[PDB]
Amino acid sequence: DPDPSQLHRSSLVKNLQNIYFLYEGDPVTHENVKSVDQLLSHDLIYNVSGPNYDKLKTELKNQEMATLFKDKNVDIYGVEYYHLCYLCENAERSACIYGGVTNHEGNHLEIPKKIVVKVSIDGIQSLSFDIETNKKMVTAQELDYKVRKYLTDNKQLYTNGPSKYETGYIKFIPKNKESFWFDFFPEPEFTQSKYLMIYKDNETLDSNTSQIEVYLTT
Amino acid sequence: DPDPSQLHRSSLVKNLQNIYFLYEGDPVTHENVKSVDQLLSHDLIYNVSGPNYDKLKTELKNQEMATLFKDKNVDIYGVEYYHLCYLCENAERSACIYGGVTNHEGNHLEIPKKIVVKVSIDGIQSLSFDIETNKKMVTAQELDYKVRKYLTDNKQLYTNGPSKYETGYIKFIPKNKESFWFDFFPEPEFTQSKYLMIYKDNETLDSNTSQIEVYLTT
Amino acid sequence: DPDPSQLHRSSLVKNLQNIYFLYEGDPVTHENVKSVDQLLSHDLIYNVSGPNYDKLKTELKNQEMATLFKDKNVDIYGVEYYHLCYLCENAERSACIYGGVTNHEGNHLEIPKKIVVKVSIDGIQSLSFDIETNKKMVTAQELDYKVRKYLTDNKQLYTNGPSKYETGYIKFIPKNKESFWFDFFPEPEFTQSKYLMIYKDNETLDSNTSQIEVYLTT
Amino acid sequence: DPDPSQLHRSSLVKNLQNIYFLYEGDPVTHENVKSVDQLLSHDLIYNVSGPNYDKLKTELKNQEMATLFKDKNVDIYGVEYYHLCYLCENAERSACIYGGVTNHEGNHLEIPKKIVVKVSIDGIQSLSFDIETNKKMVTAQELDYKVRKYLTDNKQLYTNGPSKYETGYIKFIPKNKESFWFDFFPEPEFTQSKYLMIYKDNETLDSNTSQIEVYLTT
């Protein structure tokens, strides 16, 4: 578990709104789509449209993972960025994400699984809410975005300026796997593209057995 | 005027939507704003916010024009682009425009000195609508966007796909000055940052005494 | 002819060494090559190599100029730049130039033609030197490069720092064609890609009837 | 150690010469220098020159490492790249590297320690040679380059085209510490800037108690 020393201080961050706009906006979501191209051996390019893009590139873990989803119909759920997301200098309206991929066939639920998020602020676990997913195997990114979105709208985790909290992080607890975590704040000088690397491994958890804990300090 | 041939054929332009998205959307408009920085000698950077940018860079004719508006209160009105709009890796969420700058102090009309636009579909002077601005001195770019947004929203000038027309252009007839015209369609393979260079010379005209002529074909 | 007030001052330029490296290094030269691709409608891409590049893109005046040289065997001569020369994100070892393209078939001389350059410094043209070429129809860019290459090495026109001259321009006087000139110095804050735009028109002159004059001041 | 399946096949790589150029040319070496700037919190910018560059930005592991070397007098030994080395988006002549940073104070040797490299080919120990450094603690990058530069020149590990070997990796064996290896070949579609990330950790070994082994297959 994170030691207080290695947690990013939100007050040191210059341009914290750049994170706010990543988690305040809508995520890119598409279902039953298939890769159409590749730039590097570890990414995949989809022909999908959303507001602000008509092409989507996702960067996976390595070439092994990419070629695994290459000819499969998948679902994409991710947090995109547009700056530093080039395809060929001639392809405008492009969007980029890390991971956010899972197989379409056989991964949906007719009735969605609600995960109850245990949020703790300043040591006291004074908050809890449910998040939702209709996927059996869901990426940590989809659940992460959903938690931050709620905390943003309701508890002002992020605002178009400073944040309400100094430090904070989310922790996923898989049943048979090792628990991992993400820091809600980036380094003082950062980039959306570098911060979102936390999604590159494309870690997917079983929505039926996983737990989520959030820890924030004022 | 142009020799009906050198004009650009919409049918040949692949990825026409990219043009459409530039005029179908809202323009960038700010009043009584002052330049705050500069990347190259002929551009000016403003700290203005929009639903996609936190900074706006405007490229002007030459360093002389830029040094002219550098420390003045102006009105900005242009069509911004994002792909290939770089200030530095540490300045994402930036928008770029060409010209679109006018003096603010003394240049407003208590009442919009509306200008009449006479269209001409296939030679036969067909349609004719009304444009309007409350600027004594207004840039051709501002009037050109107003003239295009309309023709789009009501005559399908551009669409999320192809165009109702093959060729087409706008002719600007200033009182005492040579008359210019902008081609409505780009080259088959274009870029938004390259096509918007038609606003780079920051050509401003008198709203009170000037006429616009739009032509088209099918 | 330029007015003294219009010439850019070298003392005002920051990072002038960036121009120095442009004209002190070797130019990119290739003979009898054919365009292998194309990015935008007005450029051409060649699969040619040199130290630092395995691909070369040349930007011409417009699409008419581009489509004219497309399927032809041309000769290339230009001053290349790398920063802001993007091909498709994974096209490392790529170079960019403006124009510098001439037809290959029947445009060469058995014996190189010598062209005298009259170099006037502070109003006194007490210097003359030689420039050579084996092209009948040569580009201004090729002659201009050869001039500055000689002036840099012999007269310290450019150095890895300041220039020995405040101003200076090259004037090309073609036989029965109007003369043109290029300013040796850029605006204070500049980029290599924007300054080299002087060659974009691909202006070519007759090496038999063309004269060159260089005006410098200290 | 890597299971043969784990190693990248060189025959599958498109543009394997982009690797060749990285290790055939001279590295960027600078001793006793101090960082003058910073773009992102995990990088350091140095005002040092070499051919093709006037600025050098080194990307380290995280912000702690960067702040750790920030104001110290360091030595730099790295393998640079230029494509995608975005700095100010108006700063040409920049070279980028990863790590390759060691403290200058109290780290040199009177006599350069020589390290023996054992090269096994197709499983048979077939060649041993010498590499040398004047540093007590040296980056794995420095030694890696030294090893590869020798094997390239003498055994055609890489060439401007294909390589003699199908797979190959280098194994660093420190005294008290776990060993680690670097694959000599990249994924089929790679980028110099992504491939060179094997040096981001800035791992440094003791030049007096470390061994190097190289395994190649044809």
UniProtKB/Swiss-Prot annotation, chains A, B, C, D:
Pfam families reported in the protein's UniProt record: Stap_Strp_tox_C, Stap_Strp_toxin
GO CC annotation terms, alphabetical: extracellular region
A single MF term (Gene Ontology): toxin activity
Presence of the UniProt keyword Signal in the record: yes
Keyword Signal included in the entry's annotation: yes
Membrane-crossing residue ranges in chain numbering: none
Cysteines joined through disulfide linkages: C85-C96
Keywords noted in UniProt: Disulfide bond, Signal, Toxin, Virulence
Top-level taxon of the source organism: Bacteria
Similarity comment: family membership: Belongs to the staphylococcal/streptococcal toxin family.
Function: Causative agent of the symptoms associated with scarlet fever, have been associated with streptococcal toxic shock-like disease and may play a role in the early events of rheumatic fever.
Remaining remarks: Binds to major histocompatibility complex class II beta chain. This toxin is coded by bacteriophage T12.
Protein name in the entry: Exotoxin type A
Lineage, uppermost ranks: Bacteria, Bacillati, Bacillota, Bacilli, Lactobacillales
